[PDB]
C-alpha cells in the first residue's frame, strides 16, 4: 500500500516525457558534471600500445521535467529506469573496445532528487590507445591519456565539467594497481576542444604518467651480457701454450651472445628504430667479436713473429677491459639521467 | 515550446513507414558518405588483414521528415535511428566489424528543416587485403575498403563521395609502426551481380614498407658473417686453430640467423626476397667451411696443390659473392 504512492509519482514523471530531447532543448546548454573513480589501473601492453582501466564513471546534470514532491527527497531507483529518460551519449575518443559490465545485473545506478538533479554512474572497463616512444626502452616513460566527451551534441548543446577541482575529480584506488613492470607516478586532469567535420565538441582529458621499471631487464639481459663479455676477455690471460683451449672461449662466447640477443629480441616490441637496449647489445656484440679477431691475429703471428704476437696480448689485457668500463659509464649516465 | 518540439517530432513519426525507402517507386535517393579515419593498426601479413577505425557519416534527403516552424538542426537521441529508414551499407571485404557501444551505442542522428538527415557511426572494421610477399620486405601493398548497398540496386540508391577528394580525412595523422601510407585514392563505380547492378565506393591505400631496420637487423649480420668467413683463406694452415674457430663460428651463426628469422616471419608458399639472400649467404659460408676441410685432409699429401687452392679461392669467393649481390639487388630493387 505504501508503494502505491511511489507508483503514482513514477508514473507521473514519465507521463508526457519524451526521452528523445535533451533537457532544455533550444533554450540553454545542458551542463554535465563528471568525476571518475579508478578502481584498478589494468596492465599496459607495449605490443599493442594500449592499456586497461576500470572506472566508476559518474555523471550528473539537471532536468526540470523530473521535479516532484513526496515522502523521500531522493529516489534510489533501479538501473532499468535509466532507459526511460534522457542520458548523455558520452563515449571515449581513444577507446579501443570497452565493456559495460552487466553481471549479474546492468551495473548502473540512477538517483533523482526532488529538484530534478540526476546522478547516473556506471562501471566500465575501457581499453584505450596510448602512443609510445620506445627510443629509450627499457628506461622510458609515457603519459597514457583518456579522452571522453559527447558524440552527437556539439559544444553549443552539451558541455562537460568536472564535479570538483580537476585535480580531485579523478581518484585512484590505493590497492587498484595491477601494473607489473610500470609504475604510476601520478595523473593529470585537463579539458580541451575538438573540431570534427560535424562541429565542435568538448573533450575532457586525463593523462596517466607511467615510468617503466628497469629491474627485470637488468636481470634477464644486461647482467648476462656483461658476464659474457667479461668471460670473453678471460682468454687473454691464458698462456700461449693452451692454443686449443682459447679456441673454445672464442667459439662458445660468440654463440652465447647469439642466444641472449635472440631471447632478448622477443621482449622488444615491433618498431622501426633502434632502441636503447639494441645499442647495448650491438656494442657488447662487437667486444665479443673483437676478441675472436684478436685471438685470430695473435695465432696468425705466433711461431712466425713471436715477439710481436706477445705484444698484442699485453695491450689486449688492458685495452679491452678499459674500453668496456668506459662504455658502461657513457651508456648509463646518458640514459638514467633522462 | 518544449512541448511544441515533441508535437512536431511525433507528427513526423506518425504514419512513417520504415519498410519503404524515400521516394519509393520513383527516382533513386542519393547518399553521400564521409569517412573520418581514426586509426589504422595491426596490418597482419599472416592473416592478410588490417584493422581500421573510423567515423562513418551518410547524408540523404527524406521528404517525409521535413518539418517547419523550428529553425534548428534537431539532434535526436540515437535510439530514434531504429524508427527511421537508413541505407543498408555494408563492406564487401569486411571480416569482423562492430559499432562501439560505450557508454551507449556510438551513433548520431541529425535532422534538418528541409529533410536532410545526417547519420554517423563509429566503426572498427577488420577488412581484408591479400598481399604479394614475393618482394618482401621491399614491397608495396595496395589495401582497399569496399562500400556497397546490399538490397538496393542503382534504380533505388546512388552513392557519391561528399566533398570529392576531401571526403576522407585524417590519413596523414596515421603513423603505422612498420609501413608508410604513400597515397590514398577514392573510386566510385557500379558493380554488376547476378541479381542486378549495385553502386560501389572504394577507398584504397598504398602502403610502402619501411626498410630502415630490416637492412640493419638482417642484411648486415648476413654480410658481415659472409665476409668474416673469407678471412680463413689468408691464414696459413699451420695456424689452423684460427681457421677452425672461424669456420665453426660462421656456419653456426649463419644457421641460427636463417632458422630464427623463419620462426618470426609470416609463412607462405613462395620464396620471399629475404629467403633468397639468407639461402645465398648460407651456401657461401658453407662452401668456405667445406673448403678448409678439403684442404686439411689433403695438405699432408700434396701441400703444393693444397696451398694453391686457397690462392684462387681468395678470388672466387669475393668475385662470386659480389656478382651474386649485384644480380640480387638489381633484380629486387
Amino acid at each position, epitope marked *: 500500500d505504501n508503494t502505491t504512492v511511489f507508483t503514482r509519482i513514477l508514473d507521473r514523471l514519465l507521463d508526457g516525457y519524451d526521452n528523445r530531447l535533451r533537457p532544455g532543448l533550444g533554450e540553454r546548454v545542458t551542463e554535465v558534471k563528471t568525476d571518475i573513480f579508478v578502481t584498478s589501473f589494468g596492465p599496459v601492453s607495449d605490443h599493442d600500445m594500449e592499456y586497461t582501466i576500470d572506472v566508476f564513471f559518474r555523471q550528473s546534470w539537471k532536468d526540470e521535467r523530473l521535479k516532484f514532491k513526496g515522502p523521500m527527497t531522493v529516489l534510489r531507483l533501479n538501473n532499468l529506469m535509466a532507459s526511460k529518460i534522457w542520458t548523455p551519449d558520452t563515449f571515449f*575518443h*581513444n577507446g579501443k573496445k570497452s565493456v559495460a559490465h552487466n553481471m549479474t545485473m546492468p551495473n548502473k545506478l540512477l538517483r533523482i532528487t526532488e529538484d530534478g538533479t540526476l546522478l547516473y554512474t556506471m562501471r566500465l572497463t575501457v581499453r584505450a590507445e596510448c*602512443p609510445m*616512444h620506445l627510443e629509450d626502452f627499457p628506461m622510458d*616513460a*609515457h*603519459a597514457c*591519456p583518456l*579522452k571522453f566527451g559527447s558524440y552527437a551534441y556539439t559544444r553549443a548543446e552539451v558541455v562537460y565539467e568536472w564535479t570538483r577541482e580537476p585535480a580531485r575529480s579523478v581518484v585512484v584506488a590505493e590497492d587498484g594497481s595491477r601494473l607489473n613492470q610500470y609504475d604510476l*607516478l*601520478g595523473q*593529470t586532469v*585537463d*579539458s*580541451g*576542444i*575538438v*573540431q570534427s567535420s560535424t562541429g565542435e565538441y568538448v*573533450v575532457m*582529458t586525463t*593523462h596517466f*604518467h607511467l615510468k617503466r621499471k628497469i629491474g627485470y631487464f637488468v636481470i634477464q639481459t644486461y647482467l648476462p651480457c656483461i658476464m659474457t663479455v667479461i668471460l670473453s676477455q678471460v682468454s687473454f690471460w691464458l698462456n700461449r701454450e693452451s692454443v686449443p683451449a682459447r679456441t673454445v672461449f672464442g667459439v662458445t662466447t660468440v654463440l652465447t651472445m647469439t642466444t641472449l640477443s635472440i631471447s632478448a629480441r622477443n621482449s622488444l616490441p615491433k618498431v622501426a628504430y633502434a632502441t636503447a637496449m639494441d645499442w647495448f647489445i650491438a656494442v657488447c656484440y662487437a667486444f665479443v667479436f673483437s676478441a675472436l679477431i684478436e685471438f685470430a691475429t695473435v695465432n696468425y703471428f705466433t711461431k712466425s713473429q713471436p715477439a710481436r704476437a706477445a705484444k698484442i696480448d699485453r695491450l689486449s689485457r688492458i685495452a679491452f677491459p678499459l674500453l668496456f668500463g668506459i662504455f658502461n659509464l657513457v651508456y648509463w649516465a646518458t640514459y638514467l639521467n633522462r | 515550446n518544449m512541448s511544441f518540439v515533441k508535437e512536431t517530432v511525433d507528427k513526423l513519426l506518425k504514419g512513417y513507414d520504415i519498410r519503404l525507402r524515400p521516394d519509393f517507386g520513383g527516382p533513386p535517393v542519393c547518399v553521400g558518405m564521409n569517412i573520418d579515419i581514426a586509426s589504422i593498426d595491426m596490418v597482419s601479413e599472416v592473416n592478410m588483414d588490417y584493422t581500421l577505425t573510423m567515423y562513418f557519416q551518410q547524408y540523404w534527403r527524406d521528404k517525409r521528415l521535413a518539418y517547419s516552424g523550428i529553425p534548428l538542426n534537431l539532434t535526436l537521441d540515437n535510439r530514434v535511428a531504429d524508427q527511421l529508414w537508413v541505407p543498408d551499407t555494408y563492406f564487401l571485404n569486411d571480416k569482423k566489424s562492430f559499432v562501439h557501444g560505450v557508454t551507449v551505442k556510438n551513433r548520431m542522428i541529425r535532422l534538418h528543416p528541409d529533410g536532410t538527415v545526417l547519420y554517423g557511426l563509429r566503426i572498427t572494421t577488420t577488412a581484408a587485403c591479400m598481399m604479394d610477399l614475393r618482394r618482401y620486405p621491399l614491397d608495396e601493398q595496395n589495401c582497399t575498403l569496399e562500400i556497397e548497398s546490399y538490397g538496393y540496386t542503382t534504380d533505388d540508391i546512388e552513392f557519391y563521395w561528399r566533398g570529392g577528394d576531401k571526403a576522407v580525412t585524417g590519413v*596523414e*595523422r596515421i*603513423e603505422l609502426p612498420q609501413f608508410s601510407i604513400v597515397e590514398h585514392r577514392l573510386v566510385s563505380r557500379n558493380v554488376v551481380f547476378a541479381t542486378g547492378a549495385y553502386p560501389r565506393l572504394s577507398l584504397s591505400f598504398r602502403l610502402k614498407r619501411n626498410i630502415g631496420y630490416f637492412i640493419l637487423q638482417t642484411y648486415m649480420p648476413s654480410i658481415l658473417i659472409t665476409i668474416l668467413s673469407w678471412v680463413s683463406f689468408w691464414i696459413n694452415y699451420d695456424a689452423s686453430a684460427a681457421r677452425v674457430a672461424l669456420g665453426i663460428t660462421t656456419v653456426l651463426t649463419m644457421t641460427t640467423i636463417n632458422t630464427h628469422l623463419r620462426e618470426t616471419l609470416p609463412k607462405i608458399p613462395y620464396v620471399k626476397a629475404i629467403d633468397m639472400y639468407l639461402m645465398g649467404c648460407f651456401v657461401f659460408v658453407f662452401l668456405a667451411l667445406l673448403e678448409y676441410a678439403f684442404v686439411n685432409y689433403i695438405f699432408f699429401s700434396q701441400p703444393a696443390r693444397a696451398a694453391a687452392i686457397d690462392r684462387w679461392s681468395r678470388i672466387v669467393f669475393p668475385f662470386t659473392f659480389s656478382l651474386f649481390n649485384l644480380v640480387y639487388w638489381l633484380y629486387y630493387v
Partner: nanobody
Amino acid sequence: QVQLQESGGGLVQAGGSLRVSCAASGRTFTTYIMAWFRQAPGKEREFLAAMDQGRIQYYGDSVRGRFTISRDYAKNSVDLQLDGLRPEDTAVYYCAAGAGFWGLRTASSYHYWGQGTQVTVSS
C-alpha cells in the same frame, strides 16, 4: 639535427589579426604534441595553446576565445592565429614539441624548442 624554425609575427597596432607560424624539420612530429609558449619581457614563460595527435586543442585561461592553434600534419607544422591583440601581448613567442610527460602545460615537458619570434603590439 632536429630544428624548430618560426616565422610570422612583427608589429601590429591595437588588435587585428597576426598569424605566427612554426615549421619543423629533421623529425616527424605526427605523434608528438606541438604547443606555443609566450615569454613576456623578464616576467616568465607562459603556456598559450597545444594540439596533440588527436587534434584536441588545449588553451590557457588568459587566451581562451582569442587565439587559435591549428597543426598541419602533412607539412609537419603548427600555426597560431592571434586576434584582438593587446599591449600586454607584446612578448616573444616560442614553438615547442614533446610528449607532455607530467602534463602538457609545463615547459619542462617539451624537449625540443624553437628559436623565437618577436611580436610587438603598438598602442
